[PDB]
Design a protein around this motif. Structure first.
Motif, PDB file in Angstrom:
ATOM      1  N   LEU A  60      -1.461 -37.781 142.245  1.00  0.00           N
ATOM      2  CA  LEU A  60      -1.424 -36.312 142.332  1.00  0.00           C
ATOM      3  C   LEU A  60      -2.860 -35.785 142.307  1.00  0.00           C
ATOM      4  O   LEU A  60      -3.670 -36.184 141.459  1.00  0.00           O
ATOM      5  CB  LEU A  60      -0.627 -35.707 141.165  1.00  0.00           C
ATOM      6  CG  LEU A  60       0.903 -35.806 141.236  1.00  0.00           C
ATOM      7  CD1 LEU A  60       1.419 -34.967 142.370  1.00  0.00           C
ATOM      8  CD2 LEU A  60       1.335 -37.242 141.393  1.00  0.00           C
ATOM      9  N   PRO A  61      -3.196 -34.875 143.232  1.00  0.00           N
ATOM     10  CA  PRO A  61      -4.564 -34.342 143.264  1.00  0.00           C
ATOM     11  C   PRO A  61      -4.803 -33.260 142.228  1.00  0.00           C
ATOM     12  O   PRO A  61      -4.813 -32.068 142.537  1.00  0.00           O
ATOM     13  CB  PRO A  61      -4.697 -33.842 144.700  1.00  0.00           C
ATOM     14  CG  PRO A  61      -3.317 -33.348 145.004  1.00  0.00           C
ATOM     15  CD  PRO A  61      -2.407 -34.389 144.380  1.00  0.00           C
ATOM     16  N   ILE A  62      -5.012 -33.693 140.993  1.00  0.00           N
ATOM     17  CA  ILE A  62      -5.228 -32.780 139.881  1.00  0.00           C
ATOM     18  C   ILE A  62      -6.691 -32.846 139.443  1.00  0.00           C
ATOM     19  O   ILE A  62      -7.133 -33.838 138.864  1.00  0.00           O
ATOM     20  CB  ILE A  62      -4.310 -33.145 138.693  1.00  0.00           C
ATOM     21  CG1 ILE A  62      -2.845 -33.148 139.143  1.00  0.00           C
ATOM     22  CG2 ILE A  62      -4.506 -32.146 137.562  1.00  0.00           C
ATOM     23  CD1 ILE A  62      -1.885 -33.756 138.124  1.00  0.00           C
ATOM     24  N   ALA A  63      -7.435 -31.789 139.755  1.00  0.00           N
ATOM     25  CA  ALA A  63      -8.841 -31.702 139.402  1.00  0.00           C
ATOM     26  C   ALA A  63      -8.959 -31.468 137.903  1.00  0.00           C
ATOM     27  O   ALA A  63      -7.984 -31.092 137.234  1.00  0.00           O
ATOM     28  CB  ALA A  63      -9.505 -30.574 140.177  1.00  0.00           C
ATOM     29  N   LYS A  64     -10.162 -31.662 137.373  1.00  0.00           N
ATOM     30  CA  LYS A  64     -10.356 -31.526 135.939  1.00  0.00           C
ATOM     31  C   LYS A  64      -9.899 -30.195 135.354  1.00  0.00           C
ATOM     32  O   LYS A  64      -9.306 -30.168 134.264  1.00  0.00           O
ATOM     33  CB  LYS A  64     -11.828 -31.792 135.597  1.00  0.00           C
ATOM     34  CG  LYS A  64     -12.130 -31.815 134.109  1.00  0.00           C
ATOM     35  CD  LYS A  64     -13.576 -32.256 133.879  1.00  0.00           C
ATOM     36  CE  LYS A  64     -13.930 -32.272 132.398  1.00  0.00           C
ATOM     37  NZ  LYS A  64     -15.378 -32.578 132.203  1.00  0.00           N
ATOM     38  N   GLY A  65     -10.169 -29.099 136.058  1.00  0.00           N
ATOM     39  CA  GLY A  65      -9.779 -27.783 135.561  1.00  0.00           C
ATOM     40  C   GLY A  65      -8.283 -27.654 135.359  1.00  0.00           C
ATOM     41  O   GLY A  65      -7.828 -27.172 134.321  1.00  0.00           O
ATOM     42  N   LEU A  66      -7.510 -28.079 136.357  1.00  0.00           N
ATOM     43  CA  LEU A  66      -6.060 -28.017 136.266  1.00  0.00           C
ATOM     44  C   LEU A  66      -5.566 -28.980 135.178  1.00  0.00           C
ATOM     45  O   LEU A  66      -4.582 -28.701 134.479  1.00  0.00           O
ATOM     46  CB  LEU A  66      -5.432 -28.377 137.624  1.00  0.00           C
ATOM     47  CG  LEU A  66      -3.904 -28.309 137.680  1.00  0.00           C
ATOM     48  CD1 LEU A  66      -3.393 -26.945 137.247  1.00  0.00           C
ATOM     49  CD2 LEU A  66      -3.457 -28.599 139.110  1.00  0.00           C
TER      50      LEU A  66
END
Length: 148
Positions: A60-66
């Motif tokens: 899943l493309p979950i960046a640090k912020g999310l």
């Protein structure tokens, strides 16, 4: 919808001090459902790239912020049911690959994290407004569309 009306209301209030209009909740739900589905669509592409036939969390493309927003949502102690989220996602085309158990269990939390981020974006559009209307939601969607 992704969760009960009362749960959406509670999250907008807890996350951003906003009184969300019950009339705008179905659109919010559909919009965030689409974003969650798209995270899974990209995850499917990543799983295939890695030669797998099953989707795992790292796909899943979950960046640090999310990811940080997800942790904050978890700490709000709001146990969202899985069935409404799965039913909402089933409204869209089936994916070719299935997801791992840890991903299935993460879905309601990701739905909650998306609501927390959406509520906070909506707030930032007009920091002093406590009761945003439909026009403000249109702007919050445009912001989300730039990154998700």
């Amino acid at each position: 919808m992704l969760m009960k009306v009362a749960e959406f209301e509670r999250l907008f209030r807890q996350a951003a001090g906003l009184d969300v209009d019950k009339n705008d909740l179905k659109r919010v739900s559909d919009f965030l459902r689409n974003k969650l589905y798209d995270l899974l669509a990209v995850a499917e592409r990543n799983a295939k790239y890695n030669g797998r036939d099953l989707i795992f969390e790292p796909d899943l493309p979950i960046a640090k912020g999310l990811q940080e927003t997800l942790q904050e949502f978890r700490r709000m102690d709001t146990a969202l049911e899985l069935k409404p989220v799965l039913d909402a996602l089933a409204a869209l085309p089936p994916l070719d690959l299935e997801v791992a158990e840890d991903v299935r269990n993460l879905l309601p939390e990701l739905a909650g994290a998306l609501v927390v981020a959406y509520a906070r974006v909506l707030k930032e559009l007009d920091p002093a407004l406590k009761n945003p209307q439909t026009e403000h939601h249109e702007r919050a969607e445009r912001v989300f569309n730039l990154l998700l």
